[PDB]
């Protein structure tokens, strides 16, 4: 019922600008103050600002004054975060959140990711992971995909277009020299591969990249 | 500003057992209206934070009675009377009494699994496609193990290799009390072709000898 959905996150160079939005539904928007809270790469939570129901009273971090501006459009059930003079320290997942009687952050959205960096947007290269040649007595076989050399986050990974979901481990991306690398493994019955195809589907919206990679025996 | 000091940093607890998480503020957090806006949040893996407890001791609607809050002045405690798998995640205290509002550093709740599990280890050679492009990544998955303590090394023709290694880690989730790990070794194609054997070797409590998976470039 109550729903909050943030948008507008993306990669920006230090010094740059970005406008974030937060769409609300399922309640009378202007009856409630709204907050921005961010989560840093180290996973610390940081309150950023709180703005009143009517939109004219605002508390905010001193370190964002003159850089971030907060306002709402009550006619359109939307909350805004206008960012400028962006810094590395502003890199974070940005959440919007609705107050309630007695509590500060009662309802949260799913967040939108802001990356402040000089590093260049780069699409991933996606490679299959298949076993060399060992234990063929195993009832299971583990396959995988390597999603290498992209920037910024995030990427999504699915297997057989979502048909395959149970035996999956997708690992968090690791950053090295301005590029991310990520892997995902899937385990299937050994009697079903290669007789039944296994494909990882990788998407990297920031570069408009989509790759489907079939896992083939060596 | 008010600092929030949260202990312990992590907390291993068997299913069904109790847990206490502590929070200390660096000064009084009684709001000017006389209330104390001390809140507790839980962030489950891959989700947004959610509200558990507000004004020190009040459960938000829908929150199980297993969670309770106490404290006064500068000293606060979240109690979980009996831990369930779904309780996995990072717990944060927060003060909304004095701006700038501030979060504690978090406490990661982990399940102390009743039984150990040896890792399922798999090693993967570079794809011919990656080789053609000039690179050679070797990947090792170490899946579904407990406890979390594990040593992983790469050997090339029997010599440990340190350079060009990236490691990624997943913690527990409500459906899974084990851990998994991924390691990726990247060389150039030419360097890859100067060596014969590639080995992923893991040391874990479940076995007295290392788990060794290899392939030969042959």
């Amino acid at each position: 019922e109550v729903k909050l959905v943030e948008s507008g996150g993306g990669l920006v160079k230090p010094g740059g600008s970005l406008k974030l939005s937060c769409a609300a539904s399922g309640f009378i928007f202007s009856n409630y103050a709204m907050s921005w809270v961010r989560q840093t790469p180290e996973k610390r939570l940081e309150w950023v600002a709180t703005i009143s129901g009517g939109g004219r009273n605002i508390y905010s971090l001193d370190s964002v004054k003159g850089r971030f501006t907060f306002f709402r459009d009550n006619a359109r059930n939307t909350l805004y975060l206008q960012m400028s003079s962006l810094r590395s320290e502003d890199t974070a997942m940005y959440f919007c959140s609705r107050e309630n009687y007695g509590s500060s952050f009662t309802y949260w959205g799913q967040g939108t990711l802001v990356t402040v960096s000089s590093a260049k947007t780069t699409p991933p290269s996606v490679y299959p992971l298949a076993p060399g040649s060992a234990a063929q007595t195993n009832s299971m076989v583990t396959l995988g995909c390597l999603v290498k050399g992209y920037f910024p986050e995030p990427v999504t990974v699915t297997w057989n277009s979502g048909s395959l979901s149970s035996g999956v481990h997708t690992f968090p991306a690791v950053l090295q020299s301005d590029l991310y690398t990520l892997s995902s493994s899937v385990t299937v019955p050994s009697s079903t591969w290669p007789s039944e195809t296994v494909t990882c589907n990788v998407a990297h919206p920031a570069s408009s990249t989509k790759v489907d990679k079939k896992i083939v025996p060596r | 500003d008010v600092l929030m000091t949260q202990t312990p940093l992590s907390l291993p607890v068997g299913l069904g057992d109790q847990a206490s998480i502590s929070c200390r503020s660096s000064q009084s957090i009684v709001h000017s209206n006389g209330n104390t806006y001390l809140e507790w949040y839980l962030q489950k893996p891959g989700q947004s934070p959610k509200l558990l407890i507000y004004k020190v001791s009040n459960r938000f609607s829908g929150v199980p009675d297993r969670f309770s809050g106490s404290g006064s002045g500068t000293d606060f405690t979240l109690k979980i009377s009996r831990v369930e798998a779904e309780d996995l995640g990072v717990y944060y205290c927060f003060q909304g009494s004095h701006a700038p509002y501030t979060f504690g550093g978090g406490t990661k709740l982990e399940i102390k699994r009743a039984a150990d599990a040896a890792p399922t280890v798999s090693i993967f050679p570079p794809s011919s496609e990656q080789l053609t492009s000039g690179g050679a990544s070797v990947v090792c998955f170490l899946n579904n193990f407990y406890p979390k303590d594990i040593n992983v090394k790469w050997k090339i023709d029997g010599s440990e290799r340190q350079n060009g290694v990236l490691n990624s880690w997943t913690d527990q989730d409500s459906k899974d009390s084990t851990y998994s790990m991924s390691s990726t070794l990247t060389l150039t194609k030419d360097e890859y072709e100067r060596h014969n054997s590639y080995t992923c070797e893991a040391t874990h409590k479940t076995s007295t000898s290392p788990i060794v998976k290899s392939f030969n470039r042959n």
Binding site: N31, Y32, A33, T50, I51, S52, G53, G54, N57, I58, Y59, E99, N100, Y101, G102, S103, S104 | H31, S32, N33, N35, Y37, G96
Partner: peptide, 13 residues
């Protein structure tokens, strides 16, 4: 007391 405190319902009991 701050007349400009942003909370609209939170501080109400």
């Amino acid at each position: 007391f701050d007349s400009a405190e942003p909370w609209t319902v939170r501080n109400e009991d």
